[PDB]
């Protein structure tokens, strides 16, 4: 803010963010990216953390190969996690009847909750890899885009405590609402 010309001044106005988010009648799912790698998505009560690397922790032979949201009930004991996972996959674009399925764990297994999707840019699943890349770009402002075109690349989502330093941005929330169709926000 300084004098420009002879009687005119140049000054700026910045809009608050915490008030708008805490003031909405419903609860909004918010996306965040901390440091330069750690992606985060917080729904109602699911504070999911997303990372990318070429580590295969799940295998098709011994797992649950989720193809439909009905089978998702066999993974977690809490409905909020199921809602968050299903709607995130719907928002990125995963129409469940024409696409490869994705792998999760049986709930009775004593190894927590986790879901992972392979998006390696190889011959097979190349189209799925590009579609997921576009979805990630649209759903995250400055996408780091790890696991460049090479041997392997698998994304993993796990439940962690929500960190109290994420910049509560709202562009990503708007894109999540726009891409996600028929998303029902509670409260």
């Amino acid at each position: 803010a300084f004098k420009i010309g002879l009687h005119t001044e140049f000054q700026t106005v910045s809009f608050s963010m915490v008030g708008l988010f805490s003031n909405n009648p419903h609860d909004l799912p918010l996306l965040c990216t901390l440091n330069k790698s750690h992606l985060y998505i917080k729904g109602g009560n699911a504070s999911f953390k997303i990372s990318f690397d070429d580590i295969a922790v799940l295998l098709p032979e011994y797992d649950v190969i989720i193809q439909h949201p009905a089978d998702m009930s066999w993974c977690s004991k809490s409905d909020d996690q199921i809602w968050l996972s299903q709607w995130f996959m719907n928002a990125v674009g995963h129409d469940w009847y024409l696409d490869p399925p994705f792998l999760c764990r049986n709930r009775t297994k004593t190894e927590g909750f986790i879901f992972q999707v392979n998006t390696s840019k190889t011959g097979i699943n190349e189209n799925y890899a590009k579609k997921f890349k576009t979805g990630m770009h649209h759903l995250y402002r400055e996408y780091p885009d790890s696991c460049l075109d090479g041997k392997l690349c698998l994304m993993k989502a796990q439940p962690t405590s929500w960190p109290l330093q994420c910049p509560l941005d709202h562009v990503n929330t708007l894109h999540f609402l726009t891409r996600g169709k028929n998303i029902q926000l509670p409260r």
Epitope: S51, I55, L59, E111, K156, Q158
Partner: antibody
Framework: VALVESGGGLVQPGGSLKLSCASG???????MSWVRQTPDRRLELVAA????????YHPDSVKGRFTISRDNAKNTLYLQMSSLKSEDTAMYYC???????????????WGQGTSVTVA | QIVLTQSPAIMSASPGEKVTITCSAS?????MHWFQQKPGTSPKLWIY???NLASGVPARFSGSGSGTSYSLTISRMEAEDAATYYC?????????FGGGTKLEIK
């Protein structure tokens, strides 16, 4: 972190046992397990208890005879197992279990263990 | 029901050498862990993730794997390296261990 065990010894082939196993770590944020080592050096997992005692698992070789329950207030574990058999004479270890690596859930701090004998 | 076969059962190396331990599976396994044990004691975790060293292992131990076959490697071993090693996989319940390998120093 330290772990102690008690309740082992010699028992007739057909009795029932209650083995007791923690200190140092709050242990309310860890999932634990019990494993067997036969007189020949061979290992096998027999009990696995989730951080919350809501989920508890045992394999076929102990299904219907081995149960494990943790007293969080005392930071202890009681494993009750009936129908003693000769093949179930071995060393028993109670071991912690935590995440080492963003996705790896592996056993930690295997205890001293106690001897169970059938004769 | 994944089974694990270790090779070889008995080792007798030289006071400072490079040794390898082979661990094959019945079916494909993604990740594998290695545990170490001394006589008259309890096993201690040594390698996790087939590539991650344990908290307090000298920088001469390493691991690798592919599909069904995994390997453990010691570059320059000393007398302290004489003990028993166990494979472990936790992909399909029940989690299964190896048959155990004993390594001794000549």
């Amino acid at each position: 972190v330290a772990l102690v065990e008690s309740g082992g010894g010699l028992v007739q082939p057909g009795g029932s046992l209650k083995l007791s196993c923690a200190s140092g770590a709050s242990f309310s944020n860890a999932g634990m397990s019990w494993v067997r080592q036969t007189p020949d050096r061979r290992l096998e997992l027999v009990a696995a208890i989730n951080r919350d005692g809501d989920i508890t698992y045992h394999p076929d070789s102990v299904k219907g005879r081995f149960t494990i329950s943790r007293d969080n207030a005392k930071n202890t574990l009681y494993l009750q197992m009936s129908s003693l058999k000769s093949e179930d004479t071995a060393m028993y270890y109670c071991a912690r279990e935590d995440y080492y690596g963003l996705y790896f859930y592996v056993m930690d701090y295997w205890g001293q263990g106690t001897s169970v004998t059938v004769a | 029901q994944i089974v694990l076969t270790q090779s070889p059962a008995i080792m007798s190396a030289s006071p400072g050498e490079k040794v390898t331990i082979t661990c094959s599976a019945s079916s494909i396994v993604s990740y594998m862990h290695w545990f170490q044990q001394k006589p008259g004691t309890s096993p201690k975790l040594w390698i996790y993730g087939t590539s991650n060293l344990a908290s307090g292992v000298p920088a001469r131990f390493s691991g690798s794997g592919s599909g069904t076959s995994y390997s453990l490697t010691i570059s320059r071993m000393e007398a302290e390296d004489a003990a028993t090693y166990y494979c472990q996989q936790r992909n399909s319940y029940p989690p299964t261990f190896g048959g155990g390998t004993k390594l001794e120093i000549k």
